[PDB]
Amino acid sequence: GGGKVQIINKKLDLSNVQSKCGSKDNIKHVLGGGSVQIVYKPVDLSKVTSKCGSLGNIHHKPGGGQVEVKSEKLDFKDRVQSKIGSLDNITHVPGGGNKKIETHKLT
Amino acid sequence: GGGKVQIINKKLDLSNVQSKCGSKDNIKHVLGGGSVQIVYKPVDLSKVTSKCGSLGNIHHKPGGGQVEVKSEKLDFKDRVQSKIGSLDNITHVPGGGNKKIETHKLT
Amino acid sequence: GGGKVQIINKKLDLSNVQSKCGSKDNIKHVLGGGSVQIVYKPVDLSKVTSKCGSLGNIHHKPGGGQVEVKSEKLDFKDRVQSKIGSLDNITHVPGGGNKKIETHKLT
């Protein structure tokens, strides 16, 4: 019907939508924003088997992982100006819905 | 019906949509934004078997991984200006919906 | 019906859409934005077998991987100006919907 003005400003957003879905529909394992996920799952299956013999000393000292994530600066110096004159629904106005705008910006 | 004005400003966004989906439809394993995912899953299956013999010392010291991710600066100095005069739905106006605009910007 | 104005400004975005999909339709393993994914999955299956003999010392010290990702600067100094005069739906106006615009920019 009437006039619309839509301004949308998004930065680091994440949406996940499931509309009118049937069966076993899924949205999994999503990272958005400045997100960080770290999965540290080393598996050690090293085996030492000795049978009917001599074995010396065992020094089982595996290294661990190092993981480093760094983020230094986020700055949102954002402006949204929206200057609208009018959204007027004039209806059934005999004799007139006349507009007069006068502007004098002197400097 | 009436006039529309749509301004959309997106930067680092992530959307995932499933509309009118049937069965076993999926959206998996998505990274957006300035996202970081680190999966550290080393598997060690190194085996030492000795049978009917001599074996010396064992020094099982595998190195670990190093992972480094760095991000230094995000700056959003963004402007959106939207200057609209009018979105007027004049209807059924005998005698007139006359507009007069007068602007005097003197400097 | 009425006039439309659509301005879209996107930078580093990621969309994934599944509309009217049937069965087992999937969107997997997507990276967007300035995203970083690091999968560290070395597999060690090195084996040492000795039978009916002598073996000395074992020094199993494999090196780990090094992974380095660096990003230095993101700057969004972006402008969107949208200057629209009018989106007027005049209808059923006997005698006239006359417009008069007068502009005097003196400097």
Author numbering:
A (entry chain C), B (entry chain A), C (entry chain B): 271 to 377
Show sentences the authors wrote.
We determined the structures of tau filaments from the cerebral cortex of five individuals belonging to three families with mutation P301L in MAPT. All cases had only tau filaments made of an identical single protofilament, with resolutions of 2.8–3.9 Å. Cryo-EM showed that the tau protofilament spans residues G271-T377 and adopts a double-layered, three-lobed fold. The cryo-EM density at residue 301 is consistent with a leucine side chain. Unlike the known structures of wild-type 4R tau filaments, which are folded into either three- or four-layered structures, the three-lobed fold of P301L tau consists of a stem of two-layered cross-β structure and two hairpin-like arms that are connected at a common junction. The short arm is made of residues 282–303, whereas the long arm comprises residues 304–342. The stem is composed of two segments made of residues 271–281 and 343–362, which are packed against each other. The C-terminal segment, which consists of residues 363–377 of tau, folds back onto the stem, from which it is separated by a non-proteinaceous density. With the exception of the short arm, the three-lobed fold of P301L tau resembles the Pick fold made of 3R tau, with the conformation of the long hairpin-like arm (residues 306–341) being nearly identical to that of the same region in the Pick tau fold. As no structure resembling that of the short arm is present in the known filament structures of wild-type tau, its formation is probably the result of the P301L mutation stabilising the local conformation at the R2-R3 junction.
